[PDB]
């Protein structure tokens, strides 16, 4: 059982995400009003795919004031009070130097952890982490924060998100 739906982005179809907000079951991409330069979200189809056919890849052109502003945000993440999960993730970039924080927390912003300020290669690899729900919550959210300046002119892709009991 994964506690995440949509992990992989097999649950959409190929091509750039023009609902943020609902296009791709299982997440939420909406950009922060402090960017004016708008990323770009796409489900791709690619042979590399680490699992399936299909990866997300966020395009950064511009950031905002904080790095929550560009973000892929799973939900809902179905959870017990008191469980451990392990967190695992496939990331990889077009060009090594990008960063990326992988955190999960309540409706109300409270994390229970995260990976933070990551480097991401050229080349996939697993990210991984425990945490603990720490509180009475069984609806929580595993925010990707994307908008780091090191970012911009880079495009970041991910897949097999999968929050598993420990
Ligand atoms: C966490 O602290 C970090 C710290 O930032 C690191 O520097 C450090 O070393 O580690 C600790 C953790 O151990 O920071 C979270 C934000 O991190 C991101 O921005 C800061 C940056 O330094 C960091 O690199 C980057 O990863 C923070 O979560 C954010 O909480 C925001 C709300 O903040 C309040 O409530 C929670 C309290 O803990 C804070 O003190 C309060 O100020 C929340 O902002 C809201 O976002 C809404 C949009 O949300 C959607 O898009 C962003 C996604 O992240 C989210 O899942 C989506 O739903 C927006 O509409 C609101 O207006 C805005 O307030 C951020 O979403 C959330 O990520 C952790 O609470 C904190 O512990
Ligand atoms: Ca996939």
Do not use: M
Not at 55 to 73: E, K, S
Not at 118 to 137: A, G, H, M, N, Y
């Amino acid at each position: 059982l994964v506690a995440n739906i949509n992990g992989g982005f097999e649950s959409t179809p190929a091509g750039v995400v023009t609902d943020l907000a609902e296009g791709v079951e299982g997440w939420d991409l909406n950009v922060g009003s402090s960017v004016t330069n708008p990323p770009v979200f796409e489900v791709l189809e690619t042979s590399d795919a680490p699992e399936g056919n299909k990866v997300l890849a966020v395009t950064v052109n511009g950031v905002g004031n904080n790095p929550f502003n560009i973000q892929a945000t799973a939900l809902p993440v179905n959870v017990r009070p008191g469980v451990t999960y392990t967190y695992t993730i496939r990331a990889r970039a077009e060009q090594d130097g990008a960063v990326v924080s992988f955190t999960v927390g309540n409706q109300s912003f409270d994390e229970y952890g995260r990976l933070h300020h990551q480097q991401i290669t050229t080349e996939w690899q697993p990210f991984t982490f425990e945490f603990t729900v720490s509180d009475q919550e069984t609806v929580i959210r595993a925010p990707i924060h994307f908008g780091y300046a090191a970012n911009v002119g880079n495009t970041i892709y991910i897949d097999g998100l999968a929050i598993v009991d420990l």
